[PDB]
Amino acid sequence: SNDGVSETLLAWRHIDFWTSEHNPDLNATLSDPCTQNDITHAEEDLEVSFPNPVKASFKIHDGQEDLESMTGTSGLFYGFQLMTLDQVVAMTQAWRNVAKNLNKIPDQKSIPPNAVQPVYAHPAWIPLITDNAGNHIGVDLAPGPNGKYAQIITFGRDFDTKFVIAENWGEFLLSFANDLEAGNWYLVDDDGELVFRDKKSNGPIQDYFEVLKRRTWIKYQLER
Amino acid sequence: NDGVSETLLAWRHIDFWTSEHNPDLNATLSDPCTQNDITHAEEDLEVSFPNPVKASFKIHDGQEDTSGLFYGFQLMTLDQVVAMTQAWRNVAKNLNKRSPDQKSIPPNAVQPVYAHPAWIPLITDNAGNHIGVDLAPGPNGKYAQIITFGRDFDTKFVIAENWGEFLLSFANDLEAGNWYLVDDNGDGELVFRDKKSNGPIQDYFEVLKRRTWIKYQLERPHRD
Q: Do A103 and B139 touch (CB under 8 A)?
A: yes
How close A121 gets to chain B, by Cα (Å)? 7
Say whether residue A98 is in contact with chain B using an 8 A CB cutoff: no
Task: Give every strand in the sheet of B179-182, ordered side by side.
Answer: B179-182, B189-193, B201-202
Evaluate the omega torsion of the peptide bond into residue A112 and state whether it is cis, within 30 degrees of 0.
yes
Contact status, residue A73 vs residue A119, Cβ threshold 8 Å: no
Residues in chain B: 224
Task: Give every strand in the sheet of A151-156, ordered side by side.
Answer: A81-82, A125-130, A135-140, A151-156, A161-166, A109-111
For residue A139, the surrounding DSSP H or E stretch is: strand A135-140
Report how far apart, in Å, the C-alpha atoms of A177 and of each of A168, A173, B100, B197 are: 15, 6, 45, 68
For A141-207, strand residue ranges (E) read: 151-156, 161-166, 186-188, 193-195
Task: Give every strand in the sheet of B119-124, ordered side by side.
Answer: B74-75, B119-124, B129-134, B145-150, B155-160, B103-105
For residue A128, the surrounding DSSP H or E stretch is: strand A125-130
Contact status, residue B107 vs residue A85, Cβ threshold 8 Å: no
Nearest to A143 among B46, B93, B136 (CB): B136
Q: Do B96 and A104 touch (CB under 8 A)?
A: no
Give first-to-last CA distance, chain B, whole Å: 28
Contact status, residue B204 vs residue B192, Cβ threshold 8 Å: yes
Report how far apart, in Å, the C-alpha atoms of B171 and of each of A137, B12, B168, B175, B190 are: 45, 9, 5, 6, 13
Residue A162, SS3 per DSSP: strand
How close B138 gets to chain A, by Cα (Å)? 7
Say whether residue A123 is in contact with chain B using an 8 A CB cutoff: yes
Residues after which chain B is discontinuous, using a C–N cutoff of 2.5 Å: 65, 99, 185
Say whether residue B113 is in contact with chain A using an 8 A CB cutoff: yes
Say whether residue A46 is in contact with chain B using an 8 A CB cutoff: no
Q: Do A113 and B92 touch (CB under 8 A)?
A: no
Residue A140, SS3 per DSSP: strand
Taking CA atoms, what residue in A is nearest to B139? Answer: A122
Evaluate the omega torsion of the peptide bond into residue B106 and state whether it is cis, within 30 degrees of 0.
yes
Residue A96, SS3 per DSSP: helix
Q: Angle at the Cα of A74 (from A73 to A77), degrees rounded to 5?
A: 130
φ, ψ dihedrals at B112, nearest 5°: -85, 70
> What pairs with residue B121 in β-bridges?
B132
What are the start-end ranges of the H helices in chain A? Answer: 5-22, 24-27, 36-46, 52-58, 85-103, 169-182, 208-223
φ, ψ dihedrals at B213, nearest 5°: -55, -50
In whole angstroms, give the CA distance from residue A138 to residue A124.
10
- Which three-class secondary structure string do you get for chain B? CCCHHHHHHHHHHHHHHHHHHCHHHHCCECCCCCHHHHHHHHHHHCCCCCHHHHHHHCCCCCECCCCECECEEEECCHHHHHHHHHHHHHHHHHHHHCCCCCEEECCCCCCCCCCCCCEEEEEECCCCEEEEEECCCCCCCCCCEEEEEECCCCEEEEEECCHHHHHHHHHHHHHHCCEEEECCCCCCEEEEECCCCCCCEECHHHHHHHHHHHHHHHHCCCCC
> What pairs with residue B149 in β-bridges?
B130
Radius of gyration of chain A measured on its C-alpha atoms: 17
φ, ψ dihedrals at B154, nearest 5°: -60, -40
Question: Residue-wise over B37-72: b if at least 16 C-beta within 10 A, else e?
Answer: bbeebeeebebebbbbbbbbbbbbbbbbebbbbbbb
> What pairs with residue B29 in β-bridges?
B63
Say whether residue B116 is in contact with chain A using an 8 A CB cutoff: yes
A-B C-beta contacts closer than 8 Å:
50
Experimental method: X-ray
* Nearest CA among B174, B166, B176, B163 for reference residue B211: B166
Stated in angstroms to one decimal place, the resolution of this structure is 2.3
